[model samples]
Target: KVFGRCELAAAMKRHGLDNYRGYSLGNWVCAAKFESNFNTQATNRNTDGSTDYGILQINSRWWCNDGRTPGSRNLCNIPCSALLSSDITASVNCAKKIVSDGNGMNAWVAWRNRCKGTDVQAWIRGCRL
Candidate 1:
């Protein structure tokens, strides 16, 4: 239940990603570790005087007025809560989109440096996103 490895692996497979050498999951987990300690429902209201919600620490104000309403925020224009839900495949897809939109998978290397190499198994086990 707490970031199930098997489930995550299955999701990776479902997303047609046979190789987990270079992916957003590594950085995703690294960021989650630093931001929320892997808590999916994590919320920080006092940080920087703004409320950041979810595992990705998506700011509700950037997407919605508050970090409560699901439909109030435009899922496409900003980060989507659905992307951070229990659905691993969906999260991976959303992360892929974010990576492509922002700066490709290379950009994620800043978070978890170990993911930069071609060691697919190392990434799969180290991050376990």
Candidate 2:
């Protein structure tokens, strides 16, 4: 649940997430920062009674099953709880699939509202990878 930006960036780089599907490392880092402050266990309840999961705050309505939500598409075929773990493997993979679906970072509302057009270079500052 406690992930520093540099630490997260290094891990993302190792996973080849630095520039995945045309999205930059800064973009991903910024999104994570705003979405969950890099806290793997983060969750947010939406106005529509849906929930956001994990560091990227993947939506329970479509990406993962939160159990409480009925008929969740579970496009990633993963449990929402899995996204709340310190191990970001499942979260990152699901995020990649989401981006590949043409949503890009726009799939994350935090990215659209907070990260878009922001100077996100600091998100990756001092990270070597």
Candidate 3:
């Protein structure tokens, strides 16, 4: 599903992505938007045969098992397809693990390039918490 901005915001908070690891929920919402345009089923391939899946675009190389990425750790310990579900729990939990590893939100290309330097609050303004 392609969630509306605030709609995704609501769902992410419910999954505990809000202010996760000291990064604001705004950046989480913003990065998720840019990562997959809020599409639960989104997927992107890396040149190395790794793939990123779901709204946060969790990478198979380190986060999920796709049976394709050569060195994939499957740190999230779930099939990459699990992230494609609309429930968002698997993906959000994996995202938490990513941050909990000390990587912070900069692990996402979208967050570093698009959300990190921006006034990320712009992503959540006018939205009900």
Candidate 4:
């Protein structure tokens, strides 16, 4: 379903997500929105001229520096794009880890919030869905 945005939307709805603006989705969407504007195949160059790859905007050096696991090349431990390519629930759970690092949003609260305004970046604050 990741092949199409509409299917992605439906999968989210069936999962009880109002939109891609919750903590998991919010962080992912925000990362994608701010870094690449939802371009699933995005890649960029860092200040050191190294390459940052994928939808989650991972730095290749970091991914490479961290070494690889079985799925590391898949982007889980290395590339942000690999992270994006992983399963949705696992991706969302991982996003939860980043978001709720003591000072971040809890899944319940994040899910309670909704995407507001037309601009995706602005939706980080949530729309109360």
Alpha-carbon RMSD, each predicted model: 5.6, 1.1, 1.0, 8.1
Order the numbered candidates by TM-score, best leading. 3, 2, 1, 4
- Put down candidate 4 lDDT per residue, 1-129, tens digits, no spaces: 122334443343444444333443343344444554444466666566555544444544434322322333332344454544534543444443444445443322222243323344343343332
Candidate 2 residue 83 Cα shift, in angstroms, is 0.4
Q: Candidate 2 lDDT, tens digit per residue, 16-113?
A: 88889987899999999889999999989988778999999999989999888776689999999999999899999999999998767888888999
Q: Among all windows of ten consecutive residues in candidate 1, which has the lowest summed lDDT?
A: 107-116
- Each model's C-alpha lDDT? 0.49, 0.89, 0.89, 0.42
Error of 2 at 66 (Å): 1.4
Query: What C-alpha lDDT does candidate 1 achieve relative to the native structure?
Result: 0.49
Clashing residue pairs found in predicted model 4: 75-82, 114-127, 114-128
Q: Please, what is the TM-score per model?
A: 0.50, 0.94, 0.95, 0.41
- The parts of candidate 4 lying over 4 Å away from their true place are 1-24, 64-129
Per-residue lDDT tens digits for candidate 3, residues 27-129, read: 9998998999999999999898889999999999998998888866989899999999978889988989998887688789988998898999898899998
* Model 1 Cα lDDT, one tens digit per residue, 1-129: 245444455455667544343453444444444555555666666444555555445555444245455445444354444545655454454445556555554433334454345344543474334
Q: List where candidate 2 sits over 4 angstroms from the true fold.
A: none
Task: Itemize residue pairs with steric clashes in candidate 1.
Answer: none
Segments of candidate 3 deviating more than 4 angstroms = none
